Amino acid sequence: HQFFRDMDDEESWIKEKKLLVSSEDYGRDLTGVQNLRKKHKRLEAELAAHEPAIQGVLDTGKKLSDDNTIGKEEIQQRLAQFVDHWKELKQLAAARGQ
């Protein structure tokens, strides 16, 4: 139950993370351009820390499996969303860079 909770709070953080990216943009068109470029740079750094964070949960889940399996399987499905979300985020970041 705890791991699940943590995962949930984590997924939440992901949403909150994306929100930040959406916040650090508004600031007069004239600067908006430089704002996007600056955002990208911060995005790369961010991602560096977001990788280990998300992975951490993933690893934990793997453990749960070996410790239970019957049940945790459902959580994996939910966690699948987490990865998917991050995946999209990565793609977006890549596009921005290019």
DSSP line for 23-61: HTT-S-HHHHHHHHHHHHHHHHHHHHHHHHHHHHHHHHH
Return the DSSP state at 12: H
Nearest residue to 61 (alpha-carbon basis) of 2, 3, 6: 3
Is residue 70 assigned to a domain? yes
The one-letter code for the residue type at 63 is: K
Residue 39 and residue 21 in contact, taking contact as beta carbons nearer than 8 Å? yes
- Write down how long the chain is: 98
Determination approach:
cryo-EM
Interacting residues of 64 by C-beta distance below 8 A, sequence separation 6+: 3, 72, 75
Name the residue among 52, 41, 50 with its Cα closest to residue 93. Answer: 41
* Residue 88 included in any domain: yes
Dihedral sign for Cα atoms in the order 86, 15, 57, 53: positive
Resolution in A: 4.8
Cβ neighbours of 44 (radius 10 Å) = 11
3-state secondary structure at position 68: coil
Domain hosting 43: range is: 2-6+31-97
> What's the total number of domains in the chain?
1
- Domain membership flag for residue 22: no
| Cα 10 to Cα 30: distance, rounded to the nearest angstrom | 35
